[PDB]
Amino acid sequence: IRVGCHKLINHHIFTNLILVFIMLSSAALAAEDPIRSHS
């Protein structure tokens, strides 16, 4: 059934966790070293 997966997508805590992961995955991009490739 597609109803079970639909409820999780349109949830209150699931959409917050995926949103805080997006703004935290960006910080992983800013911390990279551009000079030393092998670090």
Ligand X SMILES: CC(C)CCC[C@@H](C)[C@H]1CC[C@H]2[C@@H]3CC=C4C[C@@H](O)CC[C@]4(C)[C@H]3CC[C@]12C
Q: How far is the CB of 22 from ligand X (least distance, A)?
A: 11
For ligand X, the binding residue among 27, 35, 36, 37 (CB under 6 A) is 27
- Considering the rule CB under 6 A, would residue 28 count as an interface residue with ligand X? yes
- Considering the rule CB under 6 A, would residue 13 count as an interface residue with ligand X? no
Question: Nearest 5°: phi and psi at 13?
Answer: -100, -25
Q: What is the 3-state secondary structure (H, E, C) of the chain?
A: CCHHHHHHHCCCCHHHHHHHHHHHHHHHHHCCCCCCCCC
- Considering the rule CB under 6 A, would residue 35 count as an interface residue with ligand X? no
- Considering the rule CB under 6 A, would residue 31 count as an interface residue with ligand X? yes
